Write a protein that holds these residues in place. Structure first.
Motif, short mmCIF file in Angstrom:
data_model
loop_
_atom_site.label_atom_id
_atom_site.label_comp_id
_atom_site.label_asym_id
_atom_site.label_seq_id
_atom_site.Cartn_x
_atom_site.Cartn_y
_atom_site.Cartn_z
N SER A 1 32.03 35.15 35.77
CA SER A 1 33.66 34.23 36.04
C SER A 1 34.58 34.90 36.71
CB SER A 1 34.25 34.83 34.84
OG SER A 1 34.26 36.10 34.94
N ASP B 1 43.78 39.72 36.14
CA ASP B 1 43.53 38.64 35.40
C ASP B 1 43.90 38.89 33.69
OD1 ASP B 1 42.80 36.14 34.29
OD2 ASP B 1 41.21 36.34 35.18
N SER B 2 44.49 38.28 33.15
CA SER B 2 45.21 38.96 32.01
C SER B 2 44.69 37.74 30.92
CB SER B 2 46.43 38.67 31.40
OG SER B 2 47.58 36.92 32.36
N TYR B 3 43.68 36.76 31.45
CA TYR B 3 42.87 35.80 31.04
C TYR B 3 41.01 36.09 30.69
CZ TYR B 3 48.33 33.20 31.30
OH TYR B 3 48.84 33.04 30.95
N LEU B 4 41.40 36.91 31.33
CA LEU B 4 39.82 37.44 31.95
C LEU B 4 39.00 37.55 30.30
CD1 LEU B 4 37.07 37.60 33.91
CD2 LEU B 4 38.09 40.11 34.32
#
Lengths: 85, 85, 85, 85, 85, 85, 85, 85
Positions: free
Chosen positions: A15, A79-82
């Protein structure tokens, strides 16, 4: 945790991308974790810049894994969506 | 300490890499610790350049271990996150 | 089956490639089948990364072939168009 | 058990490889089981580094087999998929 | 013909190479002509992998030369431009 | 002429390049002169892809040099400005 | 002079490299000084291809040293900045 | 000075780059210091083109170091802000 996060695990490195890794690297330079010379050496990496995540794993030096706490704080703002954070 | 640091110990050589070893070697050349010829010979090393750490151990010459004080000062500036320093 | 699949047979290793082997290897690391050190050693392989399939055969350790059940489950999701599965 | 494990038996040495033996050897050095000189002598071994398992058997010194308890603890962490453990 | 083809003759082994020998060897493994252990032992060979053709001659076992009929069928598909076939 | 053209001579291989060699190789594959496996092995070559001309010389198999008549017909259309043709 | 140039002397072989040696070798092949087989055997040489200069010394055959007059004419055009010429 | 400038020293090669090295190399070609073949061989260099500075050191041939006087005159016009000049 440090290198302990190899059980985090490094199968999700799929990712990551240069869009943020480059910044990570820049910070590792700022924080004198990695030398500019060996920084440049990352550029040797096969295929996509992304494989470079394999090199990032390597740069979790067995005796220097605590430096990846710096990487974690980068990740936090990275990245707060990682996945994994 | 000199070679005494084999009890430091050389089981942590697993954390070293060419990113800094190459520079070490360059300094050993500058400091005329190792000859250019035998410097080149390091390139014979099996598998990863890293095994070369086995060769570095060898190059802690039993009668020349005090030259590794030069290596220590390199280590000092080499990596502030390295185990053992 | 385990190593029994050498009669599967390893003459079809000619169809494998780094595109998926690298992932296999990463899993062998995750599953602590192979050590990171000896993982890196795969990089010694002559010619194409593919010969590395010879090394994979070797890493079907005679006393550790049951670990290749992990490899089989990887294969399952690895390639639905692969001969032998 | 010590050398008693020759009935373990050393017909399964066929499953060992340098990927982990090298580390074993490094530990035998650390634990001052084998001398660096005679450590280097292992490199004389015919054909594959693996035959070196014959040399490892030899290095189960008849009067020093208890040192292989160190080897056992290495084996424990060495390979969880190894036959006999 | 079997070993009779030493009058074929083995002065033309100079034309063989690892590009196809490796495959031959893999087949000798598949066909259980040669043991994996002694297969690995071929790797001891002086200079070019090619000398290994000397070892192939040896592996025309005096009592097992009929196994080289397998080698002949390999040769058939191996190289349609090879002298002697 | 076949291999006789080593007196042609292979000191002029310095004029060849991948721009046309790759096509040659592709034809050797089409004409089943060289196996795909050993075709890939050309990629092992030191420094410039050009050294690969050393490998091409090798692939003038002593017993298979007549296959280079195919190479000659390639050369014919390959480069009308090439020395020796 | 021929082999007499061992007093030239072969302590300066340290200045030679594969960049020109390879060409020398190619000429020795062209001039049928060394056989292709034994040419390939040079590839056995320990460490740097350069040690191969030790092999070149050997190939100053005691009864064939006049062939090194060919080597001298190569040297002439080889490197106008080489010590000894 | 010639090679004497290894005490200049080659620890500052870290400041060089292809932006000017390429021109240096072109001049070494013009001045027939290095052969075009071995010129191309520089392209084998690990990681950044910069490591090529290691190769430049090598190309300070022990018997041909006076050719680096040409390199010095290049350096003179190369970079007026370079350390050591």
């Amino acid at each position: 945790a440090d290198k302990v996060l190899k059980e985090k695990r490094k199968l999700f490195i799929r990712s990551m991308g240069e869009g943020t890794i480059n910044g990570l690297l820049d910070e590792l330079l700022q924080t004198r974790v990695l030398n500019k010379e060996e920084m440049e050496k990352v550029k040797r990496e096969n295929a996509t810049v992304m494989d470079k995540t394999r090199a990032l794993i390597d740069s979790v030096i067995p005796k220097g894994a605590q430096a990846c706490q710096i990487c974690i704080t980068y990740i936090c703002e990275e990245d707060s969506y990682l996945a994994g954070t």
